[PDB]
């Protein structure tokens, strides 16, 4: 299953774990951010 679930995204000014990663189209990947976190 998602080998090792995708990491939270890294942005300029935001690298915390709560930051969701960006899919190619520009949407936010739900899997990158843990289930327990309240989005961002």
């Amino acid at each position: 299953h998602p080998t090792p679930l995708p990491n939270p995204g890294v942005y300029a000014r935001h690298n915390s774990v709560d930051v969701p990663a960006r899919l190619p189209d520009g949407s936010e990947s739900p899997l990158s951010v843990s289930t327990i976190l309240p989005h961002r």
Binding site: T3, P4, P8, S34, T35, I36
Partner: protein, 407 residues
């Protein structure tokens, strides 16, 4: 639900994570529930930076990728170049023997670093110092042979950057004599140590099916009992003529991987003995002057330089010699267009190199399938559900060198 699980960074700056690896752990108190992996904190652009340099120059880049296994990266690169050139069958025997000797001494060095860093991660502080005494024993040989301690550019397309210094063979014989004893001194600290075994036995378990699924290779795969080693299956650089045992284990866990590394050190010492046994004098560079690295380094009272004989040849006598030196040094060989994927058994697994040439003097593509990058897919498998202290042991057992991971 949420409220009982914390989310923490093992983070880049953490003693166990080699500074540039980010394990994002969702932990229920202190059990790892999920282990996300964050990579690229050591990305260096090597795969692209290569494209603006010639062959025999990209070597200096590739040895920097997996900096613990420099000779393996360089051998993979130069074997790819030779395969593209079709020169794999023309390389001198002595160059191949030196290549095996250096790759195996590098395997000893890389496993020593792996064991040292793991032991200090798991509190075994003296592991670092004993492993590094042993490693310094080998790094002195590396310094003598190549003039560098790491990131050597000694292995070059079609041969080596130069031949062994006269004292090198005796230094390596001394290594073959002492490495058993110093390695035994290290083993006394860990091998049967009750706290060490308790800290790694059963920890980081990964099934053979798991290894196949994630593409794991190296000690992690062989700890499942599978005797898969690219040195025996798909031989390269003349390993076919060396008698050595593929080290394997049945524990499928961190301690199995540790024992595999400790035994692979001995197998490397045995292969090094064989190398010294079958090391006959001869050229270290292909005799085809159209491709051979033209420089002949020799020491003098004024330091390491081109040998004065070579200077005389190319500046006083040999016009074709001068042209070849000039062009092979500046422009460098131009490789026929084509693709080739060549793999070696790096200490951490199947280090593959996809090499693409566009007929030019610079590589068109050099992609390293570094084993560490794929092995880090196993952080989830070997950490999730276990203790964070056990996750540290698992990650150490993977022995990820982040330079190769991020390249």
């Amino acid at each position: 639900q949420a409220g009982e699980r914390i989310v923490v960074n093992m983070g880049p700056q953490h003693p166990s994570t080699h500074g540039v690896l980010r394990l994002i752990l969702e932990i229920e108190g202190e059990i790892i529930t999920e282990a996300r992996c964050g990579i690229g904190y050591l990305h260096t652009g090597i795969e692209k930076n290569l494209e603006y340099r010639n062959w025999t120059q990209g070597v200096t880049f590739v040895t920097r990728m997996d900096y613990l296994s420099p000779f393996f990266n360089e051998t993979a690169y130069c074997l790819g170049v030779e395969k593209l050139l079709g020169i794999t069958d023309d390389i001198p025997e002595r160059a191949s023997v030196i290549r095996v000797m250096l790759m195996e001494l590098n395997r000893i060095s890389s496993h020593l670093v792996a064991l040292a860093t793991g032991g200090m991660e798991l509190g075994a502080m003296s592991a670092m110092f004993y492993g590094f005494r042993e490693r310094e024993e080998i790094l002195r040989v590396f310094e003598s042979i190549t003039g560098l301690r790491m990131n050597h550019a000694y292995i070059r397309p079609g041969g080596l950057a130069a031949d062994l210094p006269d004292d090198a063979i005796t230094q390596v014989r001394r290594l073959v004599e002492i490495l058993p004893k110093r390695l035994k001194d290290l083993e006394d600290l860990l091998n049967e140590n009750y706290i060490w075994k308790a800290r790694t036995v059963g920890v980081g378990y990964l099934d053979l099916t798991g290894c196949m699924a994630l593409g794991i290779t190296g000690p992690i795969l062989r700890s499942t009992g599978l005797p898969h080693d690219l040195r025996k299956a798909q031989p390269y650089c003349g390993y076919e003529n060396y008698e050595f045992d593929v080290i394997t284990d049945d524990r499928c866990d961190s301690y199995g991987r540790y024992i595999i590394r400790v035994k692979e050190m001995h197998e490397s010492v045995k292969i090094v003995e064989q190398c010294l046994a079958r090391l006959k004098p001869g050229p270290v560079m292909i005799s085809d002057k159209k491709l051979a690295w033209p420089a002949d380094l020799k020491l003098g009272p004024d330091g390491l330089g081109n040998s004065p004989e070579h200077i005389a040849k190319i500046m006083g006598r040999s016009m074709e010699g001068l042209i070849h030196h000039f062009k092979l040094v500046t422009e460098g060989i131009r490789v026929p267009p084509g693709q080739v994927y060549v793999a070696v058994e790096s200490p951490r697994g199947e280090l593959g190199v996809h090499m693409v040439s566009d007929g030019g003097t610079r590589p068109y593509r050099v992609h390293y399938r570094d084993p560490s990058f794929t092995n880090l897919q196993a952080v989830a498998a070997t950490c999730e559900g276990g203790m964070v202290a056990d996750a540290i042991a698992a990650v150490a057992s993977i022995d990820p060198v982040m330079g190769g991971v991020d390249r």
